[PDB]
């Protein structure tokens, strides 16, 4: 009969702890940010104020699901982690580049269509297609047509929009969004703007 007593005791420590645990988030200095990294005898958190803090106590929540880099609920003043928190054209409208069209197809959709043959032959299709040439030699149009025909999710990227660690975080967020969906078409325009 002492078993229910201990389990009724559980409605005891949890209630007070919950109240305190549900203040750091609400409090203004929450500074919810990304955990720089993790260690063991512990957390390292880069607060959204551009400050690196070291927490001996790795955090109230168990450390197994503290992935290096993720929304971290830094406490208002202790800066300890509290909660993870939630995270129209056709290929008949362009000429003079048909060979490039089939090359891009066989390199970009063939993995989408069937990749078994590539594994059978022991050669995998490279990832990432570069479109370089004079500003006139159409490639934005080719990319738009390919996206329109093939059914996937477009990911439009530009040098100016990315730049503002804002650039790195935005790039990581977009790439993660692409990773989440199995079909993904990633368009980076004037890539020379970033990779200077």
């Amino acid at each position: 009969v002492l078993r229910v007593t201990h389990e009724l005791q559980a409605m005891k420590d949890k209630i007070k702890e919950n109240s305190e645990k549900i203040k750091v988030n609400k409090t203004l200095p929450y500074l919810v940010s990304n955990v720089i990294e993790l260690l063991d005898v512990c957390a390292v958190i880069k607060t959204s104020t551009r400050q690196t803090y070291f927490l001996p106590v790795i955090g109230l929540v168990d450390a197994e699901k503290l992935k290096p880099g993720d929304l971290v609920g830094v406490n208002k003043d202790s800066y300890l982690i509290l909660e993870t928190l939630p995270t129209t054209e056709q290929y008949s409208d362009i000429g003079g580049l048909d060979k490039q069209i089939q090359e891009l197809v066989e390199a970009i959709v063939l993995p989408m269509n069937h990749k078994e043959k590539f594994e059978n032959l022991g050669i995998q299709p490279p990832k990432g297609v570069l479109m370089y040439g004079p500003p006139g030699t159409g490639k934005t149009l080719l990319a738009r047509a390919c996206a329109a025909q093939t059914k996937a999710t477009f990911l439009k990227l530009a040098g100016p929009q990315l730049v503002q660690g804002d650039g790195a975080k935005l790039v990581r967020d977009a790439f993660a969004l692409a990773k989440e969906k199995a079909p993904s078409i990633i368009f980076i325009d004037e890539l020379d703007a970033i990779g200077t």
Binding site: R3, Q9, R50, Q51, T52, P56, F118, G122
Partner: protein, 314 residues
């Protein structure tokens, strides 16, 4: 039976309560600000800087082992007294005929890597590196990572100066390289007073750790007479001219990891297109595989290679 669940229940009743104590105890640490030991002002106090930028003077708490807290050491300080706490630092022959490669290169790369006693008794400083030159690609792009295979150790690929960061980074990674004596630094595609200054790191700046820093790359258009002088650059190895039989061997090597009928007239294929380059033969194999992918042929038919051979010949 009715007691078995009670036993397990007990473990549960403690488990949730177990966390309460862990949570409560964990519910007090105030964290700390991370910084670096900028300098050791005194055995009792040292100058440090938090990542935020402000610089203070702090001291060891009880025993921070100043012997190991040399200038530059991550440490977390409490934002109530600024005291030092826990410190935490945060194919052997893929080109067919490689007799040229497995010969002078080996005898000049590993020989100075094993027995420094031999040369120091001879009184001659071991050669620090040799330069390879010849056709780009096969001799330059290829067989560059292969050197690690030949020596069986991981190497570092290093791709007047902006701020001298070339030499600066070279030296800063030199200690890491020296930490692994078998490691070899391969500053391929290396390309005033930086290249010439580049001639001074090899003499000193921690170059007594038995590593052959082979400056093997045809990329640098300008050649330094002082470097090619005996000592610095012991000797130069010219990438051998493919004989169209080494091409056959390369095709066979790359034909290995390929699914095909087997009735491949490799000699006919090599005669079809003179790619001349190991990467050209790689492209040949890739194009044959692609042609096979056309019509969905798990194998590769004979004509597919010929189309691949013809395509690269263009």
């Amino acid at each position: 039976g009715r007691l078995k669940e009670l036993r397990e229940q007990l473990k549960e009743l403690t488990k949730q309560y177990e966390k309460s104590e862990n949570d409560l105890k964990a519910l007090q640490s105030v964290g700390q600000i991370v910084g670096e030991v900028l300098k050791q002002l005194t055995e009792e106090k040292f100058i440090v800087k938090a990542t935020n930028g402000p610089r203070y003077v702090v001291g060891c708490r009880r025993q921070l082992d100043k012997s190991k807290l040399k200038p530059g050491t991550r440490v977390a300080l409490d934002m109530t007294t600024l005291t030092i706490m826990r410190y935490l630092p945060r194919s052997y022959s893929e080109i067919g005929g490689l007799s040229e490669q497995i010969r002078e290169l080996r005898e000049v790369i590993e020989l100075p890597l094993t027995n420094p006693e031999l040369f120091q008794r001879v009184g001659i400083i071991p050669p620090k590196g040799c330069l390879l030159y010849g056709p780009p690609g096969t001799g330059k792009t290829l067989l560059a990572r292969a050197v690690a295979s030949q020596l069986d150790c991981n190497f570092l690929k290093v791709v007047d100066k902006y701020i001298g960061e070339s030499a600066r980074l070279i030296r800063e990674m030199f200690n890491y390289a020296r930490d692994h004596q078998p490691c070899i630094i391969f500053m391929d595609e290396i390309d005033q007073r930086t290249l010439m200054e580049l001639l001074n790191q090899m003499d000193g700046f921690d170059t007594l750790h038995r590593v052959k820093m082979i400056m093997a790359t045809n990329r640098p258009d300008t050649l330094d007479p002082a470097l090619l002088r005996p000592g610095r650059l012991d000797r130069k190895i010219h990438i051998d001219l493919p004989n169209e039989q080494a091409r056959l061997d390369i095709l066979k090597i790359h034909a290995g990891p390929i699914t095909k009928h087997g009735e491949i007239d490799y000699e006919a294929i090599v005669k079809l297109s003179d790619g001349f380059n190991g990467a050209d033969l790689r492209n040949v194999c890739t194009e044959a595989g692609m042609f096979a992918i056309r019509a969905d042929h798990d194998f590769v038919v004979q004509e597919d290679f010929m189309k691949a051979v013809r395509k690269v010949a263009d």
